[PDB]
Amino acid sequence: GSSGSSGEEDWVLPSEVEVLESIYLDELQVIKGNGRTSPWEIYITLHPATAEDQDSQYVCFTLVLQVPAEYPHEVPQISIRNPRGLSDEQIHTILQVLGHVAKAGLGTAMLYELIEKGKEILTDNNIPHGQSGPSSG
């Protein structure tokens, strides 16, 4: 909703990716597009700083980051893929939070950050849902 006859050939989205590809070369995967939207889809599976991790990571979620054409102007579509251990409830929170970070970091690089948050979030709700019913309420 903004008359945009023409802008500039600048994009920070890629400027940040070129770096991430070096750090999370494998820890994260990036995808390119074509056409007008040419949305860049990126995936990554974060894990808690739990001890057992040393061997295996029971809980894990492939943080999906879909960077549209507007980006950064437009926050990347955040979605939890292959949510292990986490429940519909927990997952819901992860998204809401992760999203907040983006909206707050609009116009500027956020992807990198958005990812970090995911790690922390889980760290807290690492343990799987036990007894049915929220203790607090």
Curated annotation (Swiss-Prot):
Family: Belongs to the RNF25 family.
A GO BP annotation: ubiquitin-dependent protein catabolic process
Molecular function (Gene Ontology), one example: zinc ion binding
Subcellular location: Cytoplasm
Function: E3 ubiquitin-protein ligase that plays a key role in the RNF14-RNF25 translation quality control pathway, a pathway that takes place when a ribosome has stalled during translation, and which promotes ubiquitination and degradation of translation factors on stalled ribosomes. Catalyzes ubiquitination of RPS27A in response to ribosome collisions, promoting activation of RNF14. RNF25 catalyzes ubiquitination of other ribosomal proteins on stalled ribosomes, such as RPL0, RPL1, RPL12, RPS13 and RPS17. Also involved in ubiquitination and degradation of stalled ETF1/eRF1.
GO cellular component, one term: cytosolic ribosome
Species this protein is from: Homo sapiens
Parent-record interval covered: 11 to 134 of 459
Keywords on record: Cytoplasm, Metal-binding, Phosphoprotein, Transferase, Ubl conjugation, Ubl conjugation pathway, Zinc, Zinc-finger
Protein name: E3 ubiquitin-protein ligase RNF25
UniProt PTM comment: Ubiquitinated; autoubiquitinated.
Quaternary structure (record): Interacts with UBE2D2, and may also interact with UBE2E1 and UBE2E3. Interacts with RELA/p65.
